Design an enzyme around this catalytic site. Sequence first.
Site, PDB file in Angstrom:
ATOM      1  N   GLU A  31       0.807  -1.201   0.000  1.00 45.58           N
ATOM      2  CA  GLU A  31       0.000   0.000   0.000  1.00 45.58           C
ATOM      3  C   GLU A  31       0.852   1.268   0.000  1.00 45.58           C
ATOM      4  O   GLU A  31       0.701   2.123  -0.864  1.00 45.58           O
ATOM      5  CB  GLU A  31      -0.970   0.038   1.188  1.00 45.58           C
ATOM      6  CG  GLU A  31      -2.093  -0.982   1.152  1.00 45.58           C
ATOM      7  CD  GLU A  31      -3.075  -0.798   0.002  1.00 45.58           C
ATOM      8  OE1 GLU A  31      -3.118   0.282  -0.618  1.00 45.58           O
ATOM      9  OE2 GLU A  31      -3.828  -1.752  -0.276  1.00 45.58           O
ATOM     10  N   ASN A  89      -7.268   9.905  -5.999  1.00 43.10           N
ATOM     11  CA  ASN A  89      -7.994   9.093  -6.966  1.00 43.10           C
ATOM     12  C   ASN A  89      -8.882  10.087  -7.699  1.00 43.10           C
ATOM     13  O   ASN A  89      -9.973  10.434  -7.248  1.00 43.10           O
ATOM     14  CB  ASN A  89      -8.834   8.035  -6.243  1.00 43.10           C
ATOM     15  CG  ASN A  89      -8.013   7.218  -5.235  1.00 43.10           C
ATOM     16  OD1 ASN A  89      -7.041   6.539  -5.596  1.00 43.10           O
ATOM     17  ND2 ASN A  89      -8.394   7.297  -3.965  1.00 43.10           N
ATOM     18  N   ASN A 136      -9.054   4.990   2.606  1.00 42.31           N
ATOM     19  CA  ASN A 136      -9.778   5.866   1.684  1.00 42.31           C
ATOM     20  C   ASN A 136     -10.675   6.903   2.390  1.00 42.31           C
ATOM     21  O   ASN A 136     -11.459   6.562   3.285  1.00 42.31           O
ATOM     22  CB  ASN A 136     -10.595   5.019   0.716  1.00 42.31           C
ATOM     23  CG  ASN A 136     -11.153   5.826  -0.428  1.00 42.31           C
ATOM     24  OD1 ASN A 136     -12.233   6.376  -0.316  1.00 42.31           O
ATOM     25  ND2 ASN A 136     -10.416   5.901  -1.532  1.00 42.31           N
ATOM     26  N   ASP A 167     -12.810   9.477  -8.500  1.00 40.16           N
ATOM     27  CA  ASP A 167     -13.933   9.630  -7.588  1.00 40.16           C
ATOM     28  C   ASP A 167     -13.752  10.710  -6.535  1.00 40.16           C
ATOM     29  O   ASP A 167     -14.584  10.843  -5.641  1.00 40.16           O
ATOM     30  CB  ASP A 167     -14.322   8.291  -6.945  1.00 40.16           C
ATOM     31  CG  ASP A 167     -13.269   7.757  -5.978  1.00 40.16           C
ATOM     32  OD1 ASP A 167     -12.264   8.432  -5.708  1.00 40.16           O
ATOM     33  OD2 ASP A 167     -13.461   6.638  -5.469  1.00 40.16           O
ATOM     34  N   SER A 224     -11.550  10.944  -4.104  1.00 42.47           N
ATOM     35  CA  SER A 224     -11.151  10.472  -2.796  1.00 42.47           C
ATOM     36  C   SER A 224      -9.624  10.412  -2.775  1.00 42.47           C
ATOM     37  O   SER A 224      -8.980  10.452  -3.826  1.00 42.47           O
ATOM     38  CB  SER A 224     -11.749   9.091  -2.502  1.00 42.47           C
ATOM     39  OG  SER A 224     -11.187   8.071  -3.313  1.00 42.47           O
TER      40      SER A 224
END
Length: 130
Positions: free
Chosen positions: A35, A46, A60, A49, A51
């Site tokens: 990660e 991102n 998130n 979207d 986020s």
Amino acid sequence: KVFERCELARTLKRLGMDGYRGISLANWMCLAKWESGYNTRATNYNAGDRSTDYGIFQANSRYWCNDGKTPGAVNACHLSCSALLQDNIADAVACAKRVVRDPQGIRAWVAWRNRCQNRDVRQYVQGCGV
């Protein structure tokens, strides 16, 4: 802060992640590696979207923490996303514990399925004394 492998493994064990909700320490190590590369300040936008993923476990902002700019988001960990960017990972760990308390468990992170699931993850904690 960028954790060294074994340093992180010992920290996670101390924070009670070993076997939390059935998840071995090696799985948590493998998840963090893919990660964020063990980087607590890791952030990822991102664009698709609106986020952002925050911290060592890339939580998130749509579901786990609040950053105020993510549309229709919830804050299941009840934390400002800023809290997941600290060198101290206590909050990032409490939030990851919250994530796996949902039915999906460790599967909640797609990276875990791609890079850790059904693999020999021993390498992540080997020699760390955990």
